[PDB]
């Protein structure tokens, strides 16, 4: 919500441009370190030029402190239902004999089911022998054969992506506003770097990092939510455990293709001469998803999901001190037009001093066009960066002070004409 | 195991009203002749269901044996405009007929025998839905489905199509759907009984039993090899017969064996018997089991 | 067979709307498919362990048996399970597809 | 699928000025005929992008359809006197023109139609940068780029080349520089718009948006075997029409199907419609998209 | 290597191809109601001028 | 784990050596020479599916969580003091030079 707080000046060693047809253009190519703001504070960059009003800002807003989980191994799973097909045949009839049902293979295509066709789904064939003679339908006393063709098929319309985590990485959500106004929403973690159209960003220095999640397995449910399960990650699929049928995508689970992995002897068969009752002991993950669901408090930490984006987030009581870097890979910034004038006013000043929270300043800006109002003191120690619009709009940010009785005369401007603005207020001592 | 594919019990006829040009080599269907409506059923890689079930009766043999009725009209002409009773079901059925063919028979919703015919001298397309122009033509019909039946009189008019979670399939209207109806041409099983409509299926549970009817046994002679001998001239248990014939336990258990006094060796048909199906937990005797590639609209939303 | 986990099983019989009565069972998070849909245990309350060193013997039509030893994973002589198969017909007819111990016959 | 690589929609004119002797075998372009300015586009291993997008319009077809203008002069005289209009753009282009060729066409900086021609009795070299004297030569040209066009009227003159880490690509002078510039022959895409310049890009994001257009469907007939049929005779919805045609849902949604009464079957073309590109953070409808091997000047240090 | 990116050809760069399905119908650009497919060709490059030997 | 930067300096990281390249870790994409990294050659070993994709029918996003080594190089760098040794860089050639205490007792 507030504006910038930590403002730095761009050096001339990483800025080079010219002017063609009354069009001052600049280019950024280098690396500039900047201090990260607090919860809600912003960190912008001042980009000057050959005049005074030709100035564009590069703001970076910090949402809050988060403790994301470092993912690694994952697998898709869901619900499945078998489909068994019985076909009893007497002995010495085609391929239904004693020298075939004993050495029958699962991937061996049966001749009796040869009219089924080729399918890319999980299927299996068996040959359960039965009693012969004239009491059940056989011209010989040899035991009859039972051709079984069972294929798995899905009954649900969604899948779950079960993943784990071995370390907790401190993640910071940053909403970066560029020079022209192209807003973006990214995030950083430990030493990660995001590639943006203007270059890249990376977390320079942090001061938060916990560990303790090897005995926890998370379940991802896109469109509904997440889930927490208190068990180690399933590496080997087996019958009777959460995660017996794994795949690689959601469509592979909804279609039950043969490209996934499964455990042998999973489908149970109960033949009754002519009947065939084959069922499976599949563990429904929706039950555990209904039981355990984020947010959940484990030991002394609060686990939850993310706001908008997909990902697990852990909340606690971290620090706030952090450093950031800015990499410019030769970006061009133009400024054809020019900014207009605008008057500023003082509304209120509520906050603190000598603390990371700062002081919340509230001002009133009255202008006629879209511009960028900026104020500065006399000794060159504090700066005010506030975007101006058309009409009368109030703008407040977070400032830093060291004395309780704040009373300083500032100089605000929007196009090259500076005007005084005496501000005052009483703050509280917050460490 | 036994090479008895062309041996057709019963009458063994393959001709329909309108395409009786192959009546010379189609009535009956012996080991010789070139019948266009029987060769494609023996090709490896086409219809293996008839290959595994050779000792049965096809749709045409069922019509000739007063089992399956004939539609009206029996031969739907593909020349008359403004449509004709034989398009709303043919257009929603993805088939594939080879070159040089005129008529094409298939099963309708009413359980009768349908067939499309092109006027001379036209032929069918790559799918058999429409007609087009082109050598000679195979005067006959091509099986569009993978069905079979047998001789029975089991009633089953109180059973309809179930298919849980399916909007509309083929030409029947199970329920009024309004959400996301997934449309995809897929194969669907079916087992039409007697005096019933096209009852679709989901899972197949077929059983085979040993039958004692004369239309389920063979009896060949050895001349100076093999020779087609009719089993109707065989004796009975305690009766009297004109000719003699021997066999094993399945043949001697129902007829009479004369040991060395016989002149023809008989045996059981490798792939016959009474084949029943399980419908709603009841083992009924079906009359038209097979697959057909039709439109499958499954409820997605 | 063996057993590495214990699930609180709940035997439940089903009485539908028409009158069809079946007999199934549930446990933990298992789900059974019925003609009217499916059923699953939403919440449980038990679950013990401690059976990795116990091998069970199944005898259909006669009964079960408990043996205080781990599951036999390597077919070897002098131990319960020196000659194994895959099905009942492979044992009643001595099928060569089953696994046996290397050199278990003493020749003199 | 859909083998319609030679069936060019629209007029189908693949001949450039200066070498208009192939009018009999290149105007129009059908399944028959031997055109040197169209066969090399169908060779496996040369221009696979045209093989993937073979259901659109080429650069020459776009010129003949009053979409892409021509340069002045359109035919670069290879035997001029100390330079010619089309030399710097040709030296920086690394291609491999086959033997027995004379003309070589490509896209210039202004987006017009570029081409060079050698008078008899000359021919091109291994790279097409020079010529020599010589069996029978070709009667066409050779495409030096891997581009395609389509029918569009959208304006895009407010967009220029914005490449990252590139100082001078091809012949366009982007940004200034005087340090260490790496010189190498790499592949670079290009998408010329309408009333604009040759804009270069770094990544390609093309999407297909099918609709209802007469140039996106193929209608064939059957005679005494498939045969090419003119789609212009297809009747409209409540409009005019002579012959009858039918097809699937996309072909029947804009025309009128008469079931089996129609005498022509049509379907949708494989890869056709409105292919848009992602540029400047917005989707646009370009008029030329392709790749060319040119010189890339990057700032090494 | 998919044919859609056949214009890329041979290359000694750590590249990969994916196929993310999307919705079909007339809302995206297709004549069939079946879900469409998406071909992805992602390759990695180096935006730096030096490397590190760990 | 040490990081060598010829022409700029060295770096020290308090972690064991990574044998298997895991995603989201310092050193997920390895190679053989400097040209294999500056040009991204296919012969280098990298972690499986480390690239995140976000398709949007027509749009297509793809972000990566690659750990920037220059950040750690800026954080930890020689000279450093650990336990009781003075870890420093080279003074002429190349190589990590650790400094401690002691006289000289060697023969050549």
Author numbering:
A (entry chain H): 688 to 1118
B (entry chain G), D (entry chain E): 154 to 287, 290 to 379, 393 to 469
C (entry chain J): 850 to 957
E (entry chain F): 796 to 849
F (entry chain F): 904 to 1011
Provide passages from the article that reported this PDB entry.
Localized reconstruction of each of the four types of the Gn–Gc capsomers (pentamers and hexamers of type 1–3) resulted in four independent structures at resolutions between 7.7 and 8.6-Å. We first performed fitting with the localized reconstruction of the pentamer at 7.7 Å resolution, followed by fitting the resulting Gn–Gc heterodimer model to localized reconstructions of the hexamers at 8.0–8.6 Å resolution. Consistent with previous biochemical and structural studies, this fitting verified that the Gn and Gc assemble as heterodimers, which form higher order ring-like pentameric and hexameric capsomer structures on the mature virion. Domain A of the Gn forms a ring on top of these capsomers interacting with domain II of Gc, occluding a surface area of ~950 Å2. The Gn–Gc interface is formed between the β-ribbon domain of the Gn and the hydrophobic fusion loops of Gc11, which are shielded from solvent at the interface between Gn domains A and B. Surprisingly, unlike the rod-like array of extended anti-parallel Gc dimers predicted from the low-resolution modelling attempts, we observed that RVFV Gc forms a kinked conformation, not previously sampled in crystallographic investigations of class II fusion glycoproteins. Sub-tomogram averaging and MDFF fitting revealed that while non-membrane-facing capsomers retain the pre-fusion configuration, membrane-interacting pentamers undergo pronounced conformational rearrangements that allow the insertion of the Gc-residue hydrophobic fusion loops into the target membrane. This insertion event is achieved, in part, by a dramatic translational shift of the Gn, which unshields the Gc allowing it to form an extended intermediate state. Although it is tempting to speculate that the pentamers might have a lower activation barried to escape their metastable state than the hexamers, possibly due to less favourable subunit–subunit angles (72° in the 60 heterodimers making the pentamers as opposed to ~60° in the 660 heterodimers making the hexamers), this hypothesis remains to be tested.
Rift Valley fever virus (RVFV; genus phlebovirus, family Phenuiviridae) is an important example of an enveloped virus that harbours a class II fusion protein. As with other phleboviruses, RVFV displays two glycoproteins on the lipid bilayer envelope of the virion, Gn and Gc, which form higher order pentameric and hexameric ring-shaped assemblies. While the Gc glycoprotein is responsible for membrane fusion, the role of the Gn remains undefined. Virus entry is completed upon Gc-mediated fusion of the viral envelope and host cell membrane, in a pH-dependent mechanism.
